[PDB]
Specification:
This protein has about 375 residues and is an all-alpha fold. It contains 16 helices and no strands. Helix 7 runs antiparallel to helix 15. The radius of gyration is 21 Å and the shape is globular. Bound molecules: the ligand Nc1nc(N)c2nc(CNc3ccc(C(=O)N[C@@H](CCCNC(=O)c4ccccc4C(=O)O)C(=O)O)cc3)cnc2n1. The site of the ligand Nc1nc(N)c2nc(CNc3ccc(C(=O)N[C@@H](CCCNC(=O)c4ccccc4C(=O)O)C(=O)O)cc3)cnc2n1 has 19 residues, from helix 2, helix 4, helix 6, helix 7 and helix 8. One of its GO terms (biological process) is folate transmembrane transport. One of its GO terms (molecular function) is 2',3'-cyclic GMP-AMP binding.
Length: about 375
């Protein structure tokens, strides 16, 4: 129980994140294999992903707490395998929509991995496991992305070979998940315990941070691609550097020894202010011969977010019950998604306060600044009442 538990958990987190062809799904659909039109992919496929994610997060976090997290991790792996099988053996648009449902199912089961790494270790080791596994996962993503780009830049393999490699890696990840140790009204009980746990201050603070900062981080990450496109290899370089720095910062977060009873709100306020500054750097840096500054700003922003995430998960779990952690994570993620949607309704789409990408990033920076000011006020209130 000494080596294999944590080492194999980190190894599975790394390998389950290896999908070289996941960054080239869109071109593969538009390439000379699927022959899908651009409208078809943009309208009938990705909105399916978003809607299915929103409708699938709820059962996932309602059930992963009960069935233990190993079945849900196996389900995530099998859904990734099904996604690539549909990619390699799907001609109609309905097959691709089913693939997007399965991809949303995969995206909804990360809370299972987090709560699983948390349920296998003594609470005194909550932080380090939070720092290690997350880092590994991010490292995996890094490797995945890099691998894909390398296999399409230095190598001459087609998208079909890349998808076959991704399917083989997904099968290996499923085999790895098969050997994971399974830990050893009901809904009314769970809701009452959730409320009682939310009465605790640390859980409130870190769940609020999750809900109102993961949404902003996902908005910035998703919209920075089109922000840079509006103004190729450099895009991948920035993405890979940000992922690697995120893994490094999660690893570092595993090792920090900050007194969280008093210096938790301050830390969140400072990091959120830094993220607001970095988003403003991403937005207002319109000088064409300055893209290194924009890339550095994005890399540092992702590094800060992936530094704060393991701390958030560890402090949420340490102030929770046994069969609650996954549920809480899911709810936060669920709420985060909703928040993001709300913002992406009021800033980009459905008329609303419609603005270009630069103005959207300015509003995201102002949103992060508002959060930072709110958290600074909270820290001042905590200090004044002490
Ligand atoms: N037509 C079409 N259709 C598609 N469906 C499609 N799809 C893709 C895939 N694109 C992504 C990439 C990343 C993410 C994502 O979620 N991004 C996170 C991951 C961090 C990893 N870490 C985790 O979140 C994680 C992963 C595994 C287990 C636990 C965790 C965790 O939360 O700790 C981040 O920060 O970048 C979502 C979609 C590309 N092209 C497409 N084209």
């Amino acid at each position: 129980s000494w080596r294999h538990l944590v080492c194999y958990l980190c190894f599975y987190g790394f390998m389950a994140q290896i999908r070289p062809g996941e960054s080239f799904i869109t071109p593969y659909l538009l390439g000379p294999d699927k022959q899908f039109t651009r409208e078809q992919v943009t309208n009938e496929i990705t909105p399916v992903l978003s809607y299915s994610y929103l409708a699938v997060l709820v059962p996932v976090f309602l059930l992963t707490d009960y069935l233990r997290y190993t079945p849900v991790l196996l389900l995530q792996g099998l859904s990734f395998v099904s996604v690539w099988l549909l990619l390699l053996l799907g001609h109609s648009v309905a097959h691709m929509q089913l693939m997007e449902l399965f991809y949303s199912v995969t995206m909804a089961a990360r809370i299972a991995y987090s709560s699983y790494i948390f349920s296998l270790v003594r609470p005194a080791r909550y932080q380090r496991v939070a720092g290690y596994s997350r880092a590994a996962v991010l490292l995996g993503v890094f490797t995945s992305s890099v691998l894909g780009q390398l296999l399409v830049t230095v190598g001459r393999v087609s998208f079909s070979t890349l998808n076959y490699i991704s399917l083989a890696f997904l099968t290996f990840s499923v085999v790895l998940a098969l050997f994971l140790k399974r830990p050893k009204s009901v809904l009314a009980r769970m809701l009452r315990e959730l409320g009682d746990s939310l009465r605790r201050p640390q859980l409130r603070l870190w769940s609020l941070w999750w809900v109102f900062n993961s949404a902003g981080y996902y908005l910035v990450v998703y919209y920075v691609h089109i922000l840079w496109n509006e103004v190729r290899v450099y895009n991948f370089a920035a993405d890979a550097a940000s992922t690697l720095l995120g893994a490094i910062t999660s690893f570092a977060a595993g090792f920090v020894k900050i007194r969280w009873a008093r210096w938790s709100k301050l830390l969140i306020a400072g990091v959120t202010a830094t993220q607001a500054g970095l988003v403003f750097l991403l937005a207002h840096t319109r000088h064409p011969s300055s893209i290194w500054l924009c890339y550095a700003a994005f890399v540092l922003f992702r590094g800060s977010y992936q530094f704060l995430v393991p701390i958030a998960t560890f402090q949420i779990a340490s102030s929770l019950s046994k069969e609650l952690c996954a549920l809480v994570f899911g709810v936060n993620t669920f709420f985060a998604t909703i928040v993001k949607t709300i913002i992406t309704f009021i800033v980009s789409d459905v008329r609303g306060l419609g603005l270009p990408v630069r103005k959207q990033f300015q509003l995201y920076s102002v949103y992060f600044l508002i959060l930072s000011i709110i958290y600074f006020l909270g820290a001042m209130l905590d200090g004044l009442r002490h």
